[PDB]
Design a protein around this ligand. Structure first.
Ligand SMILES: [Ca+2]
Length: 104
């Protein structure tokens, strides 16, 4: 079973914790990786109901289980906040342009 399903990508709770730990470390180090500079601020224009408060940051999560190191980020992402609390798992998959949709 999937703890989080983004389009056709299945994710376990272990996948999301491994991702978030990598992103959070980069945020503490004031560093980024990839052409689009991740992690970077996430604005919740879509009004997703997060039970953790902002500021929020996004980091790519990959379908392969590897942690993101540069190269193609895919469409999925973890969103965490300033206290290193998980907000939710989101995707561009099924969404136009600059929208996101939640992972289910
Ligand atoms: Ca996995």
């Amino acid at each position: 079973a999937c703890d989080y399903t983004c389009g056709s990508n299945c994710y376990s709770s272990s996948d999301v914790s491994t991702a978030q730990a990598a992103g959070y470390k980069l945020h503490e180090d004031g560093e980024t990786v990839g052409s689009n500079s991740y992690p970077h601020k996430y604005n919740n224009y879509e009004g997703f109901d997060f039970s953790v408060s902002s500021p929020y940051y996004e980091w790519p999560i990959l379908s392969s289980g590897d942690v993101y190191s540069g190269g193609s980020p895919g469409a999925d992402r973890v969103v965490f906040n300033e206290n290193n609390q998980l907000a939710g798992v989101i995707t561009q998959t099924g969404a136009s342009g600059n929208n996101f949709v939640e992972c289910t």
